[PDB]
Symmetry: D2
Subunit: 79 residues, 4 copies
């Protein structure tokens, strides 16, 4: 059981994290830097910020919204 602060630092360093308290299964977060996104996103418009994604239960890729439940929780772990 990691705090959100611990999970956050690990996410910053390129690891994947998740909460056991989430309802959906097999989900996780991953962080992409501005440089990574400048290459990955080919759809035209220039400069991305850092974006955290959540791989969801249906295996789709979404933007992760930091819920208060998530940020206050201490049930985080590393994939």
């Amino acid at each position: 059981k990691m705090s959100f602060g611990e999970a956050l630092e690990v996410l910053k360093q390129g690891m994947q994290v998740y909460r056991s308290g989430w309802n959906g299964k097999n989900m996780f977060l991953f962080l992409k830097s501005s440089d990574a996104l400048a290459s990955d996103f080919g759809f035209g418009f220039p400069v991305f910020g850092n974006i955290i994604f959540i791989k969801t239960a249906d295996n789709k890729i979404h933007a992760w919204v930091p819920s208060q439940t998530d940020v206050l929780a201490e049930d985080w772990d590393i994939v």
Copy 2:
């Protein structure tokens, strides 16, 4: 404009903003799953399965960067939306 009306404008591909925001010249824009897949990827090597995105809403922020838009309670409840 309510947020419900701003959402309908977003789903039509146009850009929306709140006057009550602090940062200037910001706006939201929506990219669909099909749009995000178009020319997506590092382009070197092959995925087992092509990534499938959900819809993503971006915000063009006051420093002219592109971020993921987190819908705030203030945003969602506000009545000060407009089209760019």
Copy 3:
């Protein structure tokens, strides 16, 4: 069923809403004024709470899927 815009007005009118597409069951949203804080210790906005799958009350944070979805229903 309902759009998020419709769910928001139902919330403002004192009813409870949820998405049928959520993973967790037995959850819902409800809205109150934050002016209940005035007695503690400014313009008070409304607050959207979530009653969670593990029976807690938190301040709700919409995902992008939540606000784009058309599967909202009334409790």
Copy 4:
């Protein structure tokens, strides 16, 4: 303190925090405990209230706070 994880610990101890990089000036966050919330709202004594983070905005409005991803990743947090 600097990171968001540190700011959350400051919030939990009852102090106020802000980001110097925010566009709005003189804003801050504060956290109310389950006990304080149940007393204020009249329910959730234990369905039980959790903690809730609020924001006082630059226009003097009070809302439940929603973190942006930039907020959570930022290192410019400070104590009021």
